[PDB]
Design a protein. Structure first.
Lengths: 49, 49
């Protein structure tokens, strides 16, 4: 969890494939913004559940 | 939903035989204070999932 300066960080391997939905949306209908790139080419996306 | 003064109320018949856990605990470990009585015996209980 590499507690460095503030709220705890973390580092993990492939464990959350389908777990992004609940983690990124703590409530029943939260929505999260993210930036997705395929390499040198950024795109801005919105992710919900 | 009988909107009276504030955040909407409601009133429903026997529908939530097992649905109490999700409703009172939206998160993964929420706990709710509660009161239970059999009639003349007020008892204080905690409900979690």
């Amino acid at each position: 969890y590499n507690k460095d300066t503030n709220s705890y960080s973390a580092a993990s391997d492939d464990i959350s494939s389908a777990n992004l939905a609940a983690f990124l949306n703590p409530q029943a209908r939260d929505t999260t913004k993210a930036t997705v790139t395929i390499g040198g080419k950024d795109q801005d996306v919105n992710i919900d559940k």
